[PDB]
């Protein structure tokens, strides 16, 4: 049968891809950072923690189950291959489960819950909010490399927080052929907001990997791929032929089979290569994407239902959210993600900037796993 690395990253992927495409959806051509890889993470341990409907509306949506027969090893496997130091390009991706100590945690749960993520359950306290805060801050600036170190901003948990689950995912690659200096080649970027920025424009002629596509309307994107050094992952990045073509007409049929079509209809090509240097940092709100993807239940209080976890008490998704960081440049990027999903939590509302942007996907392609996926405002 096929590999199961593989097997999990595409269904991870898929699902996280779908996730994506309700963000882009609802903020039309909006300046976001996601990571697809890192949403499915959190959701397939939010599996174990939930149950009834709600635990059914997560699987259905995500395509799998964890519980399932070889599910849990086989991404584990993942973890494995895609942080293989082979790939030369780095990754790094570990889960946590933080549970309010005091929460009488249902039988058989906690060895369970090992046994499948290996990520150890952690008992912490909310009580002691500003500690808690600092445990589950730490860990992720810890596990991002120290790029997020602040996920849980002041006022985030309380008391009342019962259980939050993190994914800390960060990537760090070299390209396969950099962009000379691009210091000097700086342009004005106008902005919808009224304000005009100098991003410098990095240029390069070169042999790349590239495929045209049509979208159904008839749209011709140029889909491009700028390899990583190790030649395991690369940056694949998506723009219209026309300026005038919204890249709507992309998201709105973009998944992971798809993405999957591009890098196998693609033959290297000459072309002089221009891509922004920039350094994209936003977080995004998953309620609606997840709602939309029929995950409903668990962010209703009297609905959701966390009894796989404890059946001690009501519990319910008060937030999910995922804080991204993105460093392109010259020699490389620098990605960073951290998903979260908090029983008892406020959110400062999302800010939604949006600017005509292209598209790029990271991507581990032995597996299939799109890391990091998003738009940046197009010059």
Same mark, same amino acid.
């Given at each position: 049968?096929?590999?199961?690395?593989?097997?999990?990253?595409?269904?991870?992927?898929?699902?996280?891809?779908?996730?994506?495409?309700?963000?882009?959806?609802?903020?039309?051509?909006?300046?976001?950072?996601?990571?697809?890889?890192?949403?499915?993470?959190?959701?397939?341990?939010?599996?174990?923690?939930?149950?009834?409907?709600?635990?059914?509306?997560?699987?259905?949506?995500?395509?799998?189950?964890?519980?399932?027969?070889?599910?849990?090893?086989?991404?584990?496997?993942?973890?494995?291959?895609?942080?293989?130091?082979?790939?030369?390009?780095?990754?790094?991706?570990?889960?946590?489960?933080?549970?309010?100590?005091?929460?009488?945690?249902?039988?058989?749960?906690? /060895?369970?819950?090992?046994?499948?993520?290996?990520?150890?359950?952690?008992?912490?306290?909310?009580?002691?909010?500003?500690?808690?805060?600092?445990?589950?801050?730490?860990?992720?600036?810890?596990?991002?490399?120290?790029?997020?170190?602040?996920?849980?901003?002041?006022?985030?948990?309380?008391?009342?927080?019962?259980?939050?689950?993190?994914?800390?995912?960060?990537?760090?690659?070299?390209?396969?052929?950099?962009? /000379?200096?691009?210091?000097?080649?700086?342009?004005?970027?106008?902005?919808?907001?009224?304000?005009?920025?100098?991003?410098?424009?990095?240029?390069?002629?070169?042999?790349?990997?590239?495929?045209?596509? %049509?979208?159904?309307?008839?749209?011709?994107?140029?889909?491009?791929?700028?390899?990583?050094?190790?030649? %395991?992952?690369?940056?694949?990045?998506?723009?219209?032929?026309?300026?005038?073509?919204?890249?709507?007409?992309?998201?709105?049929?973009?998944?992971?089979?798809?993405?999957?079509?591009?890098?196998?209809?693609?033959?290297?090509?000459?072309?002089?290569?221009?891509?922004?240097?920039?350094?994209?940092?936003?977080?995004?709100?998953?309620?609606?994407?997840?709602?939309?993807?029929?995950?409903?239940?668990?962010?209703?209080?009297?609905?959701?239902?966390?009894?796989?976890?404890?059946?001690?008490?009501?519990?319910?998704?008060?937030?999910?959210?995922?804080?991204?960081?993105?460093?392109?440049?010259?020699?490389?990027?620098?990605?960073?993600?951290?998903?979260?999903?908090?029983?008892?939590?406020?959110?400062?509302?999302?800010?939604?900037?949006?600017?005509?942007?292209?598209?790029?996907?990271?991507?581990?392609?032995?597996?299939?796993?799109?890391?990091?996926?998003?738009?940046?405002?197009? /010059?």
């Amino acid at each position: 049968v096929h590999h199961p690395p593989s097997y999990v990253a595409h269904l991870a992927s898929d699902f996280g891809v779908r996730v994506f495409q309700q963000v882009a959806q609802a903020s039309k051509d909006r300046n976001v950072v996601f990571s697809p890889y890192g949403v499915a993470s959190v959701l397939a341990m939010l599996q174990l923690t939930t149950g009834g409907e709600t635990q059914q509306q997560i699987q259905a949506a995500m395509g799998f189950k964890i519980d399932d027969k070889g599910m849990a090893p086989a991404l584990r496997h993942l973890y494995k291959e895609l942080m293989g130091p082979w790939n030369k390009d780095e990754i790094s991706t570990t889960d946590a489960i933080f549970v309010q100590r005091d929460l009488k945690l249902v039988q058989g749960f906690m /060895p369970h819950f090992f046994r499948l993520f290996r990520s150890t359950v952690k008992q912490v306290d909310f009580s002691e909010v500003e500690r808690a805060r600092f445990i589950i801050n730490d860990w992720v600036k810890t596990h991002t490399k120290g790029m997020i170190s602040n996920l849980l901003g002041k006022g985030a948990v309380d008391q009342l927080t019962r259980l939050v689950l993190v994914n800390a995912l960060y990537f760090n690659g070299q390209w396969k052929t950099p962009f /000379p200096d691009s210091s000097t080649h700086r342009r004005l970027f106008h902005k919808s907001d009224g304000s005009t920025v100098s991003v410098p424009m990095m240029a390069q002629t070169n042999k790349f990997n590239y495929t045209e596509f %049509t979208t159904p309307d008839g749209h011709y994107y140029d889909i491009l791929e700028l390899p990583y050094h190790g030649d %395991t992952l690369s940056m694949f990045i998506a723009a219209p032929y026309e300026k005038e073509v919204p890249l709507s007409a992309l998201t709105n049929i973009l998944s992971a089979q798809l993405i999957s079509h591009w890098k196998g209809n693609m033959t290297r090509l000459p072309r002089l290569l221009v891509l922004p240097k920039f350094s994209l940092e936003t977080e995004v709100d998953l309620r609606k994407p997840l709602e939309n993807l029929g995950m409903t239940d668990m962010f209703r209080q009297f609905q959701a239902d966390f009894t796989s976890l404890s059946d001690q008490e009501p519990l319910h998704v008060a937030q999910a959210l995922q804080k991204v960081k993105i460093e392109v440049n010259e020699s490389g990027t620098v990605a960073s993600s951290s998903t979260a999903v908090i029983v008892s939590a406020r959110m400062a509302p999302e800010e939604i900037i949006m600017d005509r942007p292209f598209l790029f996907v990271v991507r581990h392609n032995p597996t299939g796993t799109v890391l990091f996926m998003g738009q940046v405002m197009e /010059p």
